[PDB]
Design a protein around this ligand. Structure first.
Ligand code: HEM
Length: 154
């Protein structure tokens, strides 16, 4: 799979809006992930204790984590597919240290799409969402291949 420049444009156009407030989008996305797929929260030893959305929103550390997560993703998206260098450290830590299965990357991809659909309807119409889904599917495909190379693929 490979995206067209036109599709990359749709992806980077909405991401530019996301960047107006990375911290806020990071919070919304992680909170959506944890509420839609509670099992995912268990992978965060530093935040596994959070019981409610209120506690999640009030967590300064969770906010920092969200910023780090979206900034890393933004760098990857901006490479428009030429993200081999960026995927190496990310794949290693998530496969070997955090033990994050591909299914969970699909879950966070779903959360990203949900939040963008909610916050940016004008710039996240059907075609734009399709482009973003295509970009995230490419990300997960390449990450999965790396996982396999690293001996995890899960
Ligand atoms: C869009 C996909 C994701 C990106 C770009 C991403 C990015 C990052 C980055 C940059 C870090 C810090 C450096 C590192 O350890 O590699 C990190 C840490 C971490 N990630 Fe992810 N991540 C993603 C998805 C996930 C998912 C789905 C989970 C689990 C449900 C997860 C769990 C973790 C954990 C447990 C840490 C450690 C947090 C801490 O205690 O400091 N990540 N991630």
């Amino acid at each position: 799979m490979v995206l067209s420049e036109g599709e990359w444009q749709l992806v980077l156009h909405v991401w530019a809006k996301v960047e107006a407030d990375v911290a806020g989008h990071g919070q919304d996305i992680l909170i959506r992930l944890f509420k839609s797929h509670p099992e995912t929260l268990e992978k965060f030893d530093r935040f596994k204790h959070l019981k409610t959305e209120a506690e999640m929103k009030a967590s300064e550390d969770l906010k920092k984590l969200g910023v780090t997560n979206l900034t890393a993703l933004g760098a990857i998206l901006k490479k428009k597919g030429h993200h081999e260098a960026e995927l190496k450290p990310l794949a290693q830590s998530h496969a070997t240290k955090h033990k994050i299965p591909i299914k969970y990357l699909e879950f966070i991809s779903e959360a990203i799409i949900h939040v963008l659909h909610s916050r940016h309807p004008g710039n996240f119409g059907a075609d734009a969402q399709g482009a973003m889904n295509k970009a995230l599917e490419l990300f997960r495909k390449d990450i999965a291949a790396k996982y396999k190379e690293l001996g995890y693929q899960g």
